[PDB]
Design an enzyme around this catalytic site. Structure first.
Site, PDB file in Angstrom:
ATOM      1  N   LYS A  41       1.040  -1.620   0.024  1.00 38.92           N
ATOM      2  CA  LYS A  41       0.097  -0.172  -0.374  1.00 38.92           C
ATOM      3  C   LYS A  41       0.614   1.560  -0.099  1.00 38.92           C
ATOM      4  O   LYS A  41       1.371   1.488   0.878  1.00 38.92           O
ATOM      5  CB  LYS A  41      -1.268  -0.332   1.178  1.00 38.92           C
ATOM      6  CG  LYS A  41      -2.196   0.934   1.114  1.00 38.92           C
ATOM      7  CD  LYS A  41      -3.218   0.806   2.615  1.00 38.92           C
ATOM      8  CE  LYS A  41      -3.976   2.409   1.483  1.00 38.92           C
ATOM      9  NZ  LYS A  41      -4.950   2.382   3.467  1.00 38.92           N
ATOM     10  N   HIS A 119     -14.112   5.685   5.911  1.00 36.55           N
ATOM     11  CA  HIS A 119     -12.572   5.713   5.748  1.00 36.55           C
ATOM     12  C   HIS A 119     -12.104   7.184   5.983  1.00 36.55           C
ATOM     13  O   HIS A 119     -12.456   7.635   6.320  1.00 36.55           O
ATOM     14  CB  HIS A 119     -12.935   6.530   3.993  1.00 36.55           C
ATOM     15  CG  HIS A 119     -13.772   4.946   3.331  1.00 36.55           C
ATOM     16  ND1 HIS A 119     -13.631   3.655   3.083  1.00 36.55           N
ATOM     17  CD2 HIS A 119     -15.426   5.065   3.120  1.00 36.55           C
ATOM     18  CE1 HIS A 119     -14.351   2.872   2.440  1.00 36.55           C
ATOM     19  NE2 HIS A 119     -15.358   3.342   2.196  1.00 36.55           N
ATOM     20  N   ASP A 121     -10.041  10.791   4.620  1.00 40.82           N
ATOM     21  CA  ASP A 121     -10.291  11.449   3.396  1.00 40.82           C
ATOM     22  C   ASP A 121      -8.399  12.206   3.199  1.00 40.82           C
ATOM     23  O   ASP A 121      -8.287  11.774   1.993  1.00 40.82           O
ATOM     24  CB  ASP A 121     -11.100  12.270   3.442  1.00 40.82           C
ATOM     25  CG  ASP A 121     -11.297  12.445   1.613  1.00 40.82           C
ATOM     26  OD1 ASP A 121     -11.407  11.030   0.857  1.00 40.82           O
ATOM     27  OD2 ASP A 121     -12.087  13.306   1.349  1.00 40.82           O
TER      28      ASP A 121
END
Length: 124
Positions: A41, A119, A121
């Site tokens: 990632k 999530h 952001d």
């Protein structure tokens, strides 16, 4: 499977430390949270505040998400964060990261009943 709320806790919460633990923090944490299993990632952020304080962000300042949705919220106060960013040397399966500590406002997307972060952001 893993709920969206549980996924946010795995990918982004580390209340055990107050700041970047050391120069090796990202190498250890990106691996232990399973963020290097299928690929490296490239960027990720960890937040060093209590779960309660991060969940409270869903009742704070409503702002537009980067994707154009309207369910994002910005923290009124700054929070202790660590950014992890993939280095030049890094090649899968041996992923390598630089560790940077900051104090910034966080922006999260919230969904559900109860209404909780799902999530990460941005930071500002």
């Amino acid at each position: 499977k893993e709920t969206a709320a549980a996924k946010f806790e795995r990918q982004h919460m580390d209340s055990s430390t107050s700041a970047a633990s050391s120069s090796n923090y990202c190498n250890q944490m990106m691996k232990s949270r399973n963020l290097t299993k299928d690929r490296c990632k490239p960027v990720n952020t960890f937040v060093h505040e209590s779960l309660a304080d991060v969940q409270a962000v869903c009742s704070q300042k409503n702002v537009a998400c980067k994707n154009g949705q309207t369910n994002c919220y910005q923290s009124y106060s700054t929070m202790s964060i660590t950014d992890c960013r993939e280095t030049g040397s890094s090649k899968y399966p041996n992923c390598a990261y630089k560790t940077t500590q900051a104090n910034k406002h966080i922006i999260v997307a919230c969904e559900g009943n109860p209404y909780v972060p799902v999530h990460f952001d941005a930071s500002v």
